[PDB]
Write a protein that binds this ligand. Structure first.
Ligand SMILES: *[C@@H]1O[C@H](CO)[C@@H](O[C@@H]2O[C@H](CO)[C@@H](O[C@@H]3O[C@H](CO[C@H]4O[C@H](CO)[C@@H](O)[C@H](O)[C@@H]4O)[C@@H](O)[C@H](O[C@H]4O[C@H](CO)[C@@H](O)[C@H](O)[C@@H]4O[C@H]4O[C@H](CO)[C@@H](O)[C@H](O)[C@@H]4O)[C@@H]3O)[C@H](O)[C@H]2NC(C)=O)[C@H](O)[C@H]1NC(C)=O
Ligand SMILES: *[C@@H]1O[C@H](CO)[C@@H](O[C@@H]2O[C@H](CO)[C@@H](O[C@@H]3O[C@H](CO)[C@@H](O)[C@H](O[C@H]4O[C@H](CO)[C@@H](O)[C@H](O)[C@@H]4O)[C@@H]3O)[C@H](O)[C@H]2NC(C)=O)[C@H](O)[C@H]1NC(C)=O
Ligand SMILES: *[C@@H]1O[C@H](CO)[C@@H](O[C@@H]2O[C@H](CO)[C@@H](O[C@@H]3O[C@H](CO)[C@@H](O)[C@H](O)[C@@H]3O)[C@H](O)[C@H]2NC(C)=O)[C@H](O)[C@H]1NC(C)=O
Ligand SMILES: *[C@@H]1O[C@H](CO)[C@@H](O[C@@H]2O[C@H](CO)[C@@H](O)[C@H](O)[C@H]2NC(C)=O)[C@H](O)[C@H]1NC(C)=O
Ligand SMILES: *[C@@H]1O[C@H](CO)[C@@H](O[C@@H]2O[C@H](CO)[C@@H](O)[C@H](O)[C@H]2NC(C)=O)[C@H](O)[C@H]1NC(C)=O
Ligand SMILES: *[C@@H]1O[C@H](CO)[C@@H](O[C@@H]2O[C@H](CO)[C@@H](O)[C@H](O)[C@H]2NC(C)=O)[C@H](O)[C@H]1NC(C)=O
Ligand SMILES: *[C@@H]1O[C@H](CO)[C@@H](O[C@@H]2O[C@H](CO)[C@@H](O)[C@H](O)[C@H]2NC(C)=O)[C@H](O)[C@H]1NC(C)=O
Ligand SMILES: *[C@@H]1O[C@H](CO)[C@@H](O[C@@H]2O[C@H](CO)[C@@H](O)[C@H](O)[C@H]2NC(C)=O)[C@H](O)[C@H]1NC(C)=O
Ligand SMILES: *[C@@H]1O[C@H](CO)[C@@H](O[C@@H]2O[C@H](CO)[C@@H](O)[C@H](O)[C@H]2NC(C)=O)[C@H](O)[C@H]1NC(C)=O
Ligand SMILES: *[C@@H]1O[C@H](CO)[C@@H](O)[C@H](O)[C@H]1NC(C)=O
Ligand SMILES: *[C@@H]1O[C@H](CO)[C@@H](O)[C@H](O)[C@H]1NC(C)=O
Ligand SMILES: *[C@@H]1O[C@H](CO)[C@@H](O)[C@H](O)[C@H]1NC(C)=O
Ligand SMILES: *[C@@H]1O[C@H](CO)[C@@H](O)[C@H](O)[C@H]1NC(C)=O
Ligand SMILES: *[C@@H]1O[C@H](CO)[C@@H](O)[C@H](O)[C@H]1NC(C)=O
Lengths: 115, 435, 115, 115, 53
């Protein structure tokens, strides 16, 4: 299942294909397979709203605002690993979640309907 | 000129309040109601993950305490209720034509299969299961309901594997020498844990895991006295125990298809139940402990030991299961030693006096009263020594006593190596794509 | 969650992005989170068959037959609100549901396989 | 629901549009609608990894290795029906499942990110 | 003296005098995602590769 989450950065995104196929595969044990299936749903609920519909390591067109800890995004991209940088951007998640639905998904969704 | 992207990354490593299920493997009380156990060779070792545990604060201990009490009560359901016997029992001492001097030969009335017909029989009981009112009441008819256990199940610890729910992960550090907590660098993940045995006792764990190199003292606040100080043992100690009474077990039917067992008679060598401990093995143990308590209290400290203070013998002495019998054994010859000043502090076997009870109260849940069916033959069971409980009581001199009473500390003693993480696979890392 | 369903028409389709992210987020209460998760499934079961795979406010290529209350579809598009027009087209739903799978999804699905 | 699975081959793929819309539509009966909803999920879990994101009768770009019972794949395509050929390729399923994630989905997913 | 026939080991239980012991027929249906199959074919020897289905 999991592996190499510890010491790498970005090269962990090379192996983001085993991380899903093993994922999701009385009454007290039946809380499992409900919240377990509510997860993989509620993110893919909003993942279709992100624009990236399936699994593509993909880019949107919303800007990264540089107010959100602008620290050497070519340099920290490769050396300084995840679980460190995640705490740095742990504060700004909800605000991006408003920008996932307004930039591409209020304007650009109603611009292909012009034709 | 940065343009944020969306991923399915690995770092999900949050707290996991969660449920959990088992992977165990006859209709013995575990009932094999988990899953068939996979060979699970998947301790996938990870590279350099600084993660700190908290063995004192997790829900794995809290669920494990909730599981077994519910599971063991589930085995208690289809058995015979058997409360017509709470009547005016009258007894005497066991007669031996003459001698001097733990048994009571009891005159006794009871119903039969038919509703009206009575039954004047006699049986035997111990000391601590009967009370004076000569009329002798049972020990629990203040407020209880006596319940026989079914004589087909076994009270043996049959080990339980645990597996994570589909979407979480079980984490364990293979690292060494925690002080209870610790930012353990090396770590591996599993979907399924190893087998842990359903044992239950106080003041001494048994049939447990072993240490790495030495004693690993475990607590929260050594400067607090009200803690329960855990002591991990390096090398196990053979404990032989017995109930050397050739005993005859007879059977009767109390009513409409409700069987009942009782101690009929013993063949004739009245003895006392006991346990041998190798003497020179035990002194070799305690030198390791004071070697570490110098490091946590001081170089000029006096380590003393004593027995338990008081309370019930469930709190006082060593609670102990053996082979369908529930012992209670006095352990005064194990903590009669004082180690002095932390500077220059065989072929023998000390033996402990052990008692026998039949009316138990498991986990202090008052009202539930389970009966012990006495069994025929003799009693022999052998166990390792793995875990100890000490209590700092309230000069550099210091006395320790064998504490205990919460069985949660027993399961926490053998589940400190684990933690569970929730999984939320979503990463938003910017690059220069824009399109 | 919900809002502006009352007095607007078409401009309600501007804000069809909050309407999903809050959606789907003993035994008697456990009928919930089963039929609750059977919904968002059985429509997206057939929504992948419509051709529009994810969330796009999107157009197909099947014709609107003008037998289905042909009433000023540029004029009623903006003024006369929903929950009125829905009763007008409440009768013709099942028939469109046969036309969601035959027009684009019997012919056109087996026309990109020619190459 | 089902039909014509018996005597045809390939022309059964013409009618693979009724085969999903009727699909997925105490405690002992509540094992149903859990494993019933775990199915249609765990394949579409990996179907998004295949590259074909929704319902398209679609082709990938991974090669069919000809070691896997190379028998007249224009001839057996139309005459010799399914449930016979399926036993022929029953052995080689797991290996293709490693080739669904490495050919298109290790290389080609990180080749559109170059721009 | 005549004992009842089951007070070896049992517990006698009355049935409620409102229900009927009549066979009321039961249809079975598959769960959502499976299928019930039947051959209309003839003259099995218990098993049989039934062609029509
Ligand atoms: C810590 O860990 C140790 C081991 O890791 C563990 O010790 C083991 O304890 C168990 C239970 O106390 C022991 O199991 C019992 O062993 C006896 C003796 O069996 C030996 O001898 C016979 C004949 O001499 C051989 O056939 C056999 O192979 C052994 O060599 C058995 O008699 C027991 O079986 C009976 O009891 C079971 C439960 O009641 C039944 O399931 C089983 O079918 C047998 O029942 C029959 O006899 C009963 C007699 O009263 C009768 O009532 C029944 O109706 C039926 O007729 C049982 O297997 C095991 O040997 C110990 N092993 C070691 C190495 O010591 C400790 O118990 C553990 N600590 C704690 C607290 O649990
Ligand atoms: C059934 O057997 C039990 C024990 O098997 C027995 O209970 C014991 O009875 C004796 C005698 O009554 C009690 O013995 C006392 O013990 C203390 C300390 O051990 C002694 O100091 C006592 O001696 C003083 O008291 C006597 C009372 O007359 C004086 O005669 C004597 O000179 C001393 O002043 C005394 O021996 C013993 O305490 C109990 N055991 C318990 C647990 O209570 C019981 O009596 C037997 N049943 C019958 C009906 O006899
Ligand atoms: C608890 O009981 C067990 C067995 O019930 C004891 O184990 C026994 O220990 C003795 C010596 O400690 C062993 O005897 C030796 O055996 C060797 C091997 O043949 C022999 O060469 C020696 O001369 C000697 O006789 C015995 O084999 C062993 N038995 C078993 C089954 O292990 C144990 O010592 C007891 N412990 C205590 C503290 O009483
Ligand atoms: C049940 O009745 C018995 C009657 O002997 C009580 O037993 C004694 O009670 C006193 C007062 O609590 C204690 O000092 C003794 O130690 C008790 N004797 C024993 C052998 O325990 C008992 O307390 C009663 N229980 C309740 C809940 O009322
Ligand atoms: C461990 O527990 C003890 C007492 O339970 C704590 O000791 C207190 O410490 C503060 C400041 O150091 C003193 O002002 C108090 O007087 C102490 N308590 C007593 C009863 O004297 C100690 O802080 C705890 N350790 C930790 C790490 O929390
Ligand atoms: C308890 O006392 C009773 C007194 O009746 C003993 O029962 C008698 O024992 C003798 C020989 O041991 C038999 O011949 C009698 O038939 C027994 N009486 C009955 C009514 O069965 C009994 O033995 C004593 N208990 C013990 C353990 O010795
Ligand atoms: C366990 O054994 C010890 C043996 O010493 C008993 O302790 C003695 O008890 C008497 C009276 O109860 C005291 O006068 C002694 O000072 C005690 N000695 C010690 C070392 O504690 C103890 O009562 C026994 N406990 C049980 C439950 O049997
Ligand atoms: C008590 O612990 C000791 C650890 O040394 C156990 O002894 C070994 O246990 C392993 C696995 O249980 C066996 O493969 C070895 O053969 C054992 N060695 C010896 C010399 O016995 C011992 O089994 C434990 N006690 C019990 C009852 O299991
Ligand atoms: C219950 O008690 C009755 C007493 O008559 C037993 O009935 C007879 O038992 C013998 C021995 O098994 C049989 O040979 C007879 O055929 C039985 N009579 C009838 C009418 O069946 C009965 O066996 C007892 N049941 C049990 C389980 O002990
Ligand atoms: C048991 O019952 C008999 C009569 O049924 C009575 O004579 C006897 O005293 C009773 N035994 C006790 C200990 O009360
Ligand atoms: C125990 O370990 C923690 C870190 O896990 C540390 O903060 C604390 O000082 C340690 N205490 C002792 C006595 O080593
Ligand atoms: C106990 O005594 C009986 C005879 O009353 C005998 O048959 C039995 O073998 C004895 N128990 C043992 C363990 O030898
Ligand atoms: C244990 O042994 C040491 C020497 O090996 C000795 O000094 C000590 O007194 C012994 N313990 C007791 C309680 O006598
Ligand atoms: C019964 O039918 C099976 C095939 O379904 C066949 O193998 C077997 O020989 C038949 N037996 C008889 C007695 O016809």
């Amino acid at each position: 299942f999991l592996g190499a989450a510890g010491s790498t950065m970005g090269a962990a995104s090379m192996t983001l294909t085993v991380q899903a196929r093993n994922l999701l595969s009385g009454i007290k044990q039946l809380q499992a397979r409900v919240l377990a299936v509510e997860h993989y749903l509620r993110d893919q609920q909003l993942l279709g709203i992100w624009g990236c519909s399936g699994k593509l390591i993909c880019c949107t067109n919303v800007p990264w605002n540089s107010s959100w800890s602008n620290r050497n995004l070519s340099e920290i991209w490769d050396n300084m690993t995840w679980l460190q940088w995640d705490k740095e951007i742990s504060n700004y998640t909800q605000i991006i979640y408003g920008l996932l639905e307004e930039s591409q998904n209020q304007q650009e969704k109603n611009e292909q309907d012009l034709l | 000129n940065l343009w944020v992207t969306v991923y399915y990354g690995v770092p999900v490593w949050k707290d996991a309040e969660t449920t959990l299920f088992c992977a165990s493997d006859h209709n013995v009380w575990a009932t094999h109601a988990c899953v068939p156990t996979d060979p699970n060779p998947q301790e996938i070792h990870l590279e350099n993950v600084t993660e700190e545990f908290n063995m004192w604060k997790n829900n794995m201990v809290e669920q494990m305490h909730e599981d077994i009490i519910s599971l063991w009560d589930q085995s208690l359901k289809p058995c015979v209720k058997l409360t017509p016997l709470c009547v005016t029992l009258q007894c005497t001492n066991v007669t031996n034509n003459i001698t001097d001097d733990e048994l009571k030969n009891c005159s006794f009335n009871m119903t039969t299969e038919l509703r009206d017909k009575k039954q004047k029989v006699y049986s035997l009981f111990y000391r601590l299961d009967v009370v004076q009112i000569k009329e002798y009441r049972l020990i629990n008819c203040n407020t209880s309901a006596i319940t026989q256990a079914c004589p087909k199940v076994s009270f043996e610890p049959i080990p339980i594997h645990y597996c994570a729910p589909a979407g979480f992960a079980i984490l364990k550090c293979k690292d060494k020498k925690f002080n209870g907590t610790g930012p353990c660098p090396s770590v591996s993940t599993v979907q399924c844990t190893h087998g842990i045995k359903p044992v239950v006792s106080t003041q001494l764990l048994l049939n447990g895991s072993l240490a790495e190199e030495e004693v690993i003292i475990r607590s929260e606040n050594i400067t607090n006295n009200a803690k329960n100080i855990l002591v991990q043992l390096n090398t196990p100690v053979q404990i032989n125990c017995t109930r050397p009474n050739n005993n005859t077990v007879k059977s009767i039917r109390i009513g409409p298809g409700q069987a009942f067992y009782y101690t009929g008679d013993i063949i004739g060598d009245i003895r006392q139940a006991h346990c041998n401990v190798s003497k020179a093995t035990w002194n070799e143990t305690l030198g390791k402990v004071v070697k570490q308590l110098r490091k946590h209290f001081g170089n000029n400290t006096i380590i003393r030991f004593a027995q338990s203070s008081g309370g019930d013998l469930e709190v006082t002495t060593h609670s102990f299961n053996c082979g369908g019998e529930f012992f209670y054994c006095n352990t005064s010859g194990l903590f009669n030693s004082t180690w002095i000043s932390n500077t220059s502090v065989s072929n023998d076997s000390i033996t402990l006096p052990c008692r026998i009870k039949q009316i138990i109260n498991m986990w202090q849940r008052i009202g539930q009263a389970m009966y012990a069916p006495p069994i025929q033959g003799v009693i022999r069971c052998v166990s390792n020594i793995t875990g100890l409980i000490l209590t700092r009581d309230g000069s550099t001199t210091e006395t320790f006593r064998p504490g205990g009473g919460d069985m949660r500390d027993n399961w926490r003693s053998e589940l400190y190596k684990y933690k569970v993480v929730k999984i939320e696979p979503l990463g938003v890392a910017p690059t220069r794509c824009k399109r």
